[PDB]
Amino acid sequence: SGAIYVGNYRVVNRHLATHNDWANLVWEDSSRDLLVSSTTAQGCDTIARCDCQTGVYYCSSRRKHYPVSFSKPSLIFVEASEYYPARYQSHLMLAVGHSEPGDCGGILRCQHGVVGIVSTGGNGLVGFADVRDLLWLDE
């Protein structure tokens, strides 16, 4: 679990969005596993606007932060789960690191701010949904 709180927006994994997120929907994209909802309170986070390929993410299944090198946002095949059919997930960045399904929502940050959230993982892999291209989150 986890979310990004920026301005009057809450960014979460689309597959983990609540009834309240859907009732206050701003934007969602199944191909990216992202959903953004509106909030009444001002958010605590800053979004990175950069091309960093290293950073640190929070891994809830270890209660620890890990440094990672990750690939640029791209279209990557993701196997079928309970939440989605087998498909290509866009704007996804992969890195070698520990992840379990419940780690989704953990933030990946670089020196400039929030880069994205955990969305996929495998045998020693962790995948992050990028948010750096969503310029409207800052206005």
Ligand X SMILES: Cn1ncc2c(NC(=O)N3CCC[C@H](C(N)=O)C3)cccc21
For residue 29, the tally of other CB atoms under 10 A from its CB is: 15
Instruction: Give the nearest distance from C-beta 94 to ligand X in angstroms.
Output: 11
Q: Which of 4, 94, 110, 126 binds Zn ion (CB under 5 A)?
A: 110
Which residues ranging from 63 to 82 are in contact with ligand X (CB under 6 A)? 78, 81
Residues 6+ apart with CB under 8 A from 85: none
In the annotation, is 91 catalytic?
A: no
Select from 38-46, 48-56, 63-71, 100-108 the region that touches ligand X (CB under 6 A). Answer: 100-108
Is residue 124 close enough to count as binding ligand X by CB under 6 A? Answer: no
Annotated catalytic residue, options 21, 59, 104, 130: 104
3-class state of residue 41 by DSSP: coil
* Distance separating alpha carbons of residues 129 and 116, to the nearest angstrom: 5
Is residue 108 close enough to count as binding ligand X by CB under 6 A? Answer: no
Per-residue CA distances from 73 to 44, 91, 93, 108 (Å): 25, 4, 5, 13
Annotated catalytic residue, options 21, 33, 103, 130: 33
Which residues ranging from 22 to 41 are in contact with ligand X (CB under 6 A)? 33
Nearest Cα to Cα of residue 25 among 11, 46, 15: 11
Point out which residues bind Zn ion (CB under 5 A): 48, 50, 52, 110, 112
Binding residues for Zn(2+) are 50, 52, 110, 112
